[PDB]
Ligand code: HEM
């Protein structure tokens with residue numbers, strides 16, 4: 001009953017609280033986290049657009065202050081990473097991003113769609129063959145696929161899938177979790193390991209070359225592009241976290257939300273050409289990220305409310321995606337929604353998601369082939385899906401399902 005019901009870290013059903021915030025206090029200061037909480041769509045899209053007033057430099061600063069022990073651990077481990085791009089500000093961001101998109105060329109996207117599809121069918125069949133005819137859409141399908149894709153694109157061993165998810169859970173907990181000074185210690189070590197592997201791969205590209213993003217970036221350095229080895233390594237640190245966890249969550253939510261609405265799963269079975277629009281509606285209705293942070297570089301206003309220089313802003317895009325002023329019946333999941341692409345789950349402006357297409361790519365491929373091979377798929381029960389507490393990432397821990405077999 002406090003802060004209009006908003007619980008910053010509970011990710012199981014924040015949408016009722018989002019709804020009353022939009023009506024009662026659209027720009028609310030939450031002392032429990034230190035942020036101005038913004039919930040209406042215009043307000044949020046405007047804040048994204050004016051990057052010159054609202055810096056993103058705190059997007060990767062931890063919500064809870066790093067404790068003495070994690071600070072010593074990461075310092076003694078040589079951890080010098082902050083942010084590949086998402087918390088970089090111009091001129092550094094502009095300069096580094098343009099070099100990144102000259103290696104993130106969308107031909108690589110569409111060139112190896114077939115090996116994505118061949119890998120889904122592999123995973124779908126192994127799920128359909130086991131003692132119990134019950135599966136988990138996260139571990140059985142959505143855990144591997146985007147991870148292997150991003151490891152193949154950058155040049156990591158695809159045998160290290162469990163190391164990179166262990167490093168992802170750490171980064172997602174260290175930075176947006178409600179961690180104590182003890183609880184940072186195990187993730188502190190993981191981030192040190194993760195940063196040292198990012199640096200090990202960059203030195204590898206100098207020495208032995210390759211055929212991949214890591215090689216291409218160093219290859220652009222050798223050809224005169226203004227990007228250092230600390231920035232090459234920071235670009236891997238960004239892509240080897242953001243490049244799969246959000247996409248794992250999107251795939252898991254595709255089956256979570258479509259199986260909660262069997263009528264639209266049934267329409268997806270009828271017509272697999274509706275699948276792309278379904279993904280657009282899942283992204284609006286259940287985004288992987290519900291909140292993203294910014295920092296006021298000067299005294300300003302959001303929606304009439306005065307905000308001091310240096311104040312932190314939390315843009316609740318999960319709330320914006322249901323604003324009745326932009327989405328009629330915003331709280332209903334409807335894959336036929338005409339303007340679902342107006343959603344802000346990939347952001348807006350100079351930090352827009354670099355791999356939005358690569359994520360939607362694998363989301364559509366997973367629906368296309370799971371609806372075909374397993375058209376009778378459905379949830380086990382109604383109350384069997386929990387979400388890890390976080391400020392930004394709303395990750396379902398499991399999507400338990402069964403089928404006709
Ligand atoms: C699967 C669903 C995904 C969602 C919902 C998502 C969401 C976001 C959001 C909210 C931002 C910040 C936008 C802003 O501040 O303006 C962002 C930026 C970014 N995303 Fe994604 N993302 C997803 C997948 C991916 C994938 C697959 C990749 C790479 C393969 C990726 C890489 C990045 C990078 C590098 C940035 C920072 C770009 C910059 O700061 O210029 N993300 N994403």
Ligand SMILES: CCc1cccc(OP(=O)(O)O)c1
Nearest residue numbers: 001002003004005029030031
């Ligand atoms: C416990 C309910 C309550 C009572 C008084 C103030 C208040 O304000 P808030 O906690 O800052 O939202 C809440």
Ligand SMILES: CCc1cccc(OP(=O)(O)O)c1
Nearest residue numbers: 083084085086087237238242
């Ligand atoms: C999903 C957007 C995102 C999230 C976390 C890190 C990141 O990359 P980085 O901040 O540049 O290291 C991107």
